[PDB]
Structure formats: C-alpha cells, structure tokens
Design a protein around this nucleic acid. Sequence first.
DNA 1: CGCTTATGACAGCCGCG
DNA 2: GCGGCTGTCATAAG
Length: 903
Amino acid sequence: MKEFYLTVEQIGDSIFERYIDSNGRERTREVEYKPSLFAHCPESQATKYFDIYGKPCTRKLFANMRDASQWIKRMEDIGLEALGMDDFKLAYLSDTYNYEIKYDHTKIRVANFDIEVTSPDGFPEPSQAKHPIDAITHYDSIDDRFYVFDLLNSPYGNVEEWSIEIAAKLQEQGGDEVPSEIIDKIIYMPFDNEKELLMEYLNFWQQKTPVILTGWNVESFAIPYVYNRIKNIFGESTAKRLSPHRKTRVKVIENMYGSREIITLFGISVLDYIDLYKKFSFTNQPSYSLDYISEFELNVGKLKYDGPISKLRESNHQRYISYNIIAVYRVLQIDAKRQFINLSLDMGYYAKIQIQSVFSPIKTWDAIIFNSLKEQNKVIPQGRSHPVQPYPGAFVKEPIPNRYKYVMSFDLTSLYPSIIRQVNISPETIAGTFKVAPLHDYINAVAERPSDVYSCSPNGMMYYKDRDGVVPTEITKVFNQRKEHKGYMLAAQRNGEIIKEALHNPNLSVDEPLDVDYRFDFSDEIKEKIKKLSAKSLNEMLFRAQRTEVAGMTAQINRKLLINSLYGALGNVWFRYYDLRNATAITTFGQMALQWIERKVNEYLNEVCGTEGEAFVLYGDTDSIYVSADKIIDKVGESKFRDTNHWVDFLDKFARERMEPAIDRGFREMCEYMNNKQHLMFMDREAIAGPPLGSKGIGGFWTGKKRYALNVWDMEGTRYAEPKLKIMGLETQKSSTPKAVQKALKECIRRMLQEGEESLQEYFKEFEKEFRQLNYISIASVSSANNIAKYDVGGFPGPKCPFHIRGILTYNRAIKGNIDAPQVVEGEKVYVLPLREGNPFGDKCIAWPSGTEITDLIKDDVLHWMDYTVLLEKTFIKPLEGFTSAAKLDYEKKASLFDMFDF
DNA sequence: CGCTTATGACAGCCGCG
DNA sequence: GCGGCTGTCATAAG
Ligand SMILES: O=[N+]([O-])c1ccc2c(ccn2[C@H]2C[C@H](O)[C@@H](COP(=O)(O)OP(=O)(O)OP(=O)(O)O)O2)c1
Ligand SMILES: [Mg+2]
C-alpha cells in the first residue's frame, strides 16, 4: 500500500509526524524541515517559478522554519511581498506526499471515551479537578474493545465489583440491558485506589495512542478533567504523557463567572462528536445532551436511574458503570448512522490537512488551492490583512400574502459554484472591468452588451475564456463528487417509496430481505419481487434504504457546504484569496440570473396560456422560482382527472417536456449576453403542490419572505405514496417553539392544506381544551443563553435585558445558596416559561438548563405558577393567527348573527 | 488561529384629549 | 395603557 500520514505537528525547529509505513505499521518522525518561501525578482532573471499573476519569483531555501518565519516578518518590516506557504505543516505534507492519498481506516486508531466523576456539591469543574475519577470507558478502533476502568474505593463510599452477567440481563430482570453486540467486547478492570487507576490508564494510553480522539463533549470536559486531575495528583510532567510528543497547550477562556479550560494534546487530532454533529448534522436542536440526540437519532429511551446522578454510584454502582459503558456505545451508534468520522477522514486527506482542520473551510480550501498550484510550479500570494466590509448578497422576492392552490417550483443546481464555473471567476483570471449599467437594464436585456471578447459579470468584472482558473477547476472536482452522492440519495429515496407503498398490503409469509444495493433504482425484476415479501422483510429493507439515504444525504449536503464555502471564503478577510470584486461578481450575477428567468418564465406562460401581463411567478429566493400552476390547470378544466395522481403526472410532464426547454433557451441567451465560458445554468424541477381532488383544502400559502407552506406530491422526481408537507420558516421549523406546539401547528397546517376550513376549527378547539394537560417540558419555549453577564446587575434585569435572559436571572436567585443545584451555562440552550402575577420568584418568567428537568428545589412552585394562558396565546395562537390571516381563513367562528334562529 | 437576506419576540421610546 | 417604530437577539432560508 501507498504511505499515508496520521498527525502532523510543528514543535520549534522540528516537525513531528505519525504515519502508516510501507507495510501498515504505525511510526513516528522528527524531521528538521527545510522550507522554501519565495520573493519577486527581476524579469531578466531566468526561472522555473511564477506566481498566479505570471510575475517571476526566486525560491529561497532556509536552514530551518525559525529562520523562515524571521524572513517573512523582515519582508513586511520593509514592505515587500513574502510569497509561499507560511504554514510549514501543510508544505511539509505536500512535499512528503506529492501524490493523491489513499488510506486504510482499519489502520487509524480512533478512540471513543467518557469518564465519570461523583460530585455531591454541584458540577465538577475541569479547571480545579478536585473530585476523583471513579470510572472511564475507552473504545479502541483497532482492538474493537471497550476498556472499562472501575474504582471501588472513594471518599464518597466503597462498592463491590461490577457484574458482566447482570449488566447483560434486561432491566426488567433487574439488569442493565448492555446490548449483546458488545457484551463480549468489554474488558473490565476494577481498581482499589484512584492513583492505581489513573496510573494504569496512562500506560494503556501509551501502548494504544489514539490518532483520532472522539466522544461526547470531550473537548469541554473529559480531556481537561483527566489532564487536570492527573496534574493535581502526579504533577504537570506526568500529564504530558497524554501527548505522544509530551507537549500540551492550556487555554483559559475564562467566563465572567467561572473558569473554562481547553487543552491541546500535540500529535493527537481531537474531533468532539458534539462539534461534528453541530457542523454536519444540519439540525439545530433544543438540547445537546447525549440522551436527547440518542432519542432523536436512534429511537432509544433514556438511561433511567433513581435519585440524583451524584449519588448514583452509591445507590447503584452496577447501573453507574453500565451507563458509562452505554454512553460510549451510543456515540458509536450515532456515528454508524451519520458517518461524520468517515466524512472527516475523506475531506482531511483529500485536502492534505490536519484532520481537525475539517472545521475550517478557509484552511481546507487554502490547502486544496495551494496543492493544486504547487503541481503546476505556481507560487501562492501572501495573506494580506483587510478591513471588514458588508457587501450585497442575494435577491429575495416580496410575495403577496395569500393562499395558492397549485404550485410548481424550480431551483438552480449549485447556483453560486456554477456562476464561478460559467463566468470563470478566479483570482488570476481577472481580465479587466467595464462601465456598469443599472442591473434592471441587464435583467430587461436593455443595456449594451458588456464585452464581446471576455467573460462578464453584471457587477463590472471581466474574465478570460482562454484558460482555466484554480477556483473554477478545484470547485468542479468537489461538485462532481456532490452530484454523484446526490444521485444515490435520490435513488434510495425513490427506492424507499417503492417499499413504503408495498406495505399497503404485505403477504403473510416467512422469508428473508433481498440482497440489493439501495444506491440504485430497483430493476423491473426486483420491483416485482418486492410486494411478494413479508412485513418483517419490508420493515428491514425500508430501514436499510433510509440508512443509505441518510448516509448519501451526509455525503452530498456537506460537499455542497464546502463548495458554497469557497464563495464564502472569497468574502472572508482571513482567506488568502479574499476579493470582493469576485464575491460580488457572484451575488450580483445571481441577482440578475434569478430576475432574468423570472421575466422569461412570465413570458412563455403568458403566450402558452393566451392572456397577457400575468404574473405567474409568485415567489423567489436567491435561485428559486415558485410558479402559480392554477391557470395551467384551468385550460384543461377543473374536473378532467380521475384521481389526484393524474394532475401530478400531467404537470411533471408539462414542466419537463415544455417549461425546462423554454428555461434552457432563456439562460443560454443570458449566457450569450454575458459572453461566458460555458453555459451552466440548469433549473432542476423541485416540487409539485396542491390539495387532494374533491377536498376543501387550500394546497398552500405564503405569509411573507422566507415563510410558506405547501402540500407536496412529488419532490425532485421522487413520487410520494403519501403527500408530505414542505414547511419553511414558519414556527414549526424553529427549535425555539415548544415541542407540543410544533406538532399542534403542523397539524393545523395539514388540516388547512389537505382538508380545509372546517377541519381546522375542530383541531383548534380540542387542542386548547387539552393544552392545560400537557407535560410542562413539551410546552416550554427554548432559547440560547448568550451574554448573561451583560445584563447581570446584581442578579436583576439591567437595561434592555432580553426576556429569556430575565428568566435566567430569576432562576439564579431562587437556587442561590444550594450549590448542588444545576447551573445555567453561558452559550447553552435553556427552557423558558412565563409566570403569573405575584408569584414567589418575584418576576414574570423563569428559565432553566434545557434537555433536563428542573430541580425539586423549585420544580413544584414553578409548575404551580405556570401561566398557561399567556403560553398558549404567544406560542400557539399568535402564530396560527399569522397563518390564518394570510390564508384568509378564520380558525374560530365570528359574529354569525345566525345565532338568533338556532336549534 | 478564522457569506448575505430576512422574520419575529421583546425592550424602550413616542404620540395619544 | 395599547399600537408604531427602531434596535438587539435568536434563528431561520438561501
Ligand atoms: O458560506 N456559506 O456557508 C454559504 C454561502 C452561500 C450559500 C450557503 C447556502 C446557500 N448559499 C447560496 C449559494 C447557493 O448556490 C445559493 C442557493 O442555494 P440552494 O440552497 O438553492 O442550493 P445550491 O447551492 O443552489 O445547490 P442545489 O440547489 O443543487 O442544492 O445560495 C452557505
Ligand atoms: Mg440551488
């Protein structure tokens, strides 16, 4: 196999690398790296090296990296450009591995761990680490074993060993329900003193040193605490044994209240799963506790225990240890579904960066671009400093608030990257400028053609057509990858819908799930072989089909992020290729393209229809058009379709067979007009929306910008057995809405779109008749706790103090004194509830840490003073009234004046 | 060491016989 | 003591 790296670091004058060798063994190196930077030199000098603008450079070899950095600052102390790759880690990798990296994951040691700390006086701060570590579970990627480190004796009590035979039993038999799949993979190790325990962990750590270190919340807790606990007991020197090269950096990002520690272990790449999730899940959550994410992702109930967590070790040591084991396991199960560690590995090696740099789009692209240039012997510019400056972005159409019965939508495929490609926008391909007309002229085809020789954006920039730019080229690679994985995702989605209507009646039979790849459309044979399978066999395939969709979704949506992030970096001041002439060339172009095709669509439909001046496009956001399909149905008359599924097929045909050909013509005209390299504006048909036939439902509605709802029958080719609701921007999609109100409002919209006026009023009445009965958590709002300190003012609301922050302050007053009570942490999410006049807390609202239940200290008082009437009014009634007004419905029953002749 | 556009819940202030 | 507006903040749609 080819050689590949693990972790690279720079410690002084040397580079420390871990890597896999010729055969597959892990090694280490200390390379006194001699780097090469560049300087501009006279044209008269013959050379091999040129920068991106063509101007000639001379290479400078350095004795060491320390002299190399000295030279750079000396070059700016004088005012001359210091060219080349200033991050020597990246250059060193580029030198050593001057080829495309293939890697074997079975060789990479990925470690998942979690620790436990008993603490009778509140949450144990990693800074101090004053309380003892009584348990650690440590999963090893290569051994495939769960290493358990128990502690039997502690100043907070002494306990007998943990039983593997009891942990395996169901919780209904008084066991723990540690899953069977791992019962044979646990390695148990009891310890009689903490020193003995921690001492063993490090020797263990030494023989099995993690390359990739993951786990739940390990950056903020586990790592700092095992580092600091060891520090307090064995001294700072012994702690450094956590780092393969014995170097660690400590970062005290101390809050306005308490301390906060971030340790950096050199030679290890830490990827906290909480961070991976936040970056790659594309889901804003009300809580980020492991129990919450597990329930959400896996449908597995919480790890139940009696009494306070602090005394769980004392009360029930068996459960304690078992729950530590399961906690590590859940992260593994989530990852098995989300593929975030795999995703991180692909990107990190593709760009030749430190794996933990996957979180930075600026770094990832800087490297990709850097390497791409290096192979053509090109020299990269110096990273200048720039002042932060707002610049114009996309165009969003102002829609007339209303209902819309039949709607059809179209969306441009990676609009911003395609603009980059079409127009050939790159730092070194800048040709010149032209004098700009008002954008409407360009939209209306009125303005004079900008150039007949270069590639033009309506912001006044010109580009060469003759060559290829690094940006357009490198962006096309990741885009093609994204296009691939989107095809599988859409396939398994289409596949799933075939399995989903196939359990409208499964055969009573005993068989086995078919052996197929869900990444592809089922062939006519297997399509026919499906409905011949059983419920138990279909529920298995359905689940697998969705597993592959989930995994394909991950792969696609994140490649889409990275390519949109290249445009983003162009508009970021720390990016080497920061250039607002390029950033605005993109957005201005998009503003034009969207409005151009709006005009053009309104034309082809006026003609095809017969009428004149009709606005068919009701809405648009950035690169999307929403088309009023009503008048196109009128031509065929309302009643001429046997069932719902007929007007969907018809419209899908009218779109693909008629509209898209018209669109494709409309854009190449724009292409000619802007004289671009290659026509790359393709509109993919998205949604088909409307009510069921013979139903009083309304189909869809808009309330404003970014806020609308639609009843969708086909999304991007995928035909649904059951119609799904496309809901955007409304409260049902916000993580700040209470969970019960999310569901209730989703039901109101479904009854509005699919069934009609009457159906709505029925659900409204019953819900508010039952609202008082719901679990308080399910009807609490959610907000994030930012800048608590700013409005603190002795524990009372200061000037301009936000509502949720107010709730936080009133919470802190009530719990003051009792140090065991859960503290509210800066930056984290909180539950918020309104309070009734003259309550014991002496303020109008309370807030506590989210994902949790409130402490028995105040729990009953607050539950007892909850303001159900305000809660229902603001979280539920106002939003509904919002939807209703736009839909022009009632949800109630107004002054009938029929009231008199009732009965 | 590292994107803009937009809505809504609130605070605060202002006019209002 | 309520609506209109501006600004801060949380959070969505791209
Ligand atoms: O820096 N960012 O993080 C960033 C920058 C720009 C971004 C986005 C998210 C969207 N855009 C811009 C650039 C996109 O091309 C355009 C429209 O987005 P979209 O949701 O329609 O998806 P596309 O990127 O067009 O691709 P798709 O339509 O095939 O999904 O809106 C994110
Ligand atoms: Mg798009």
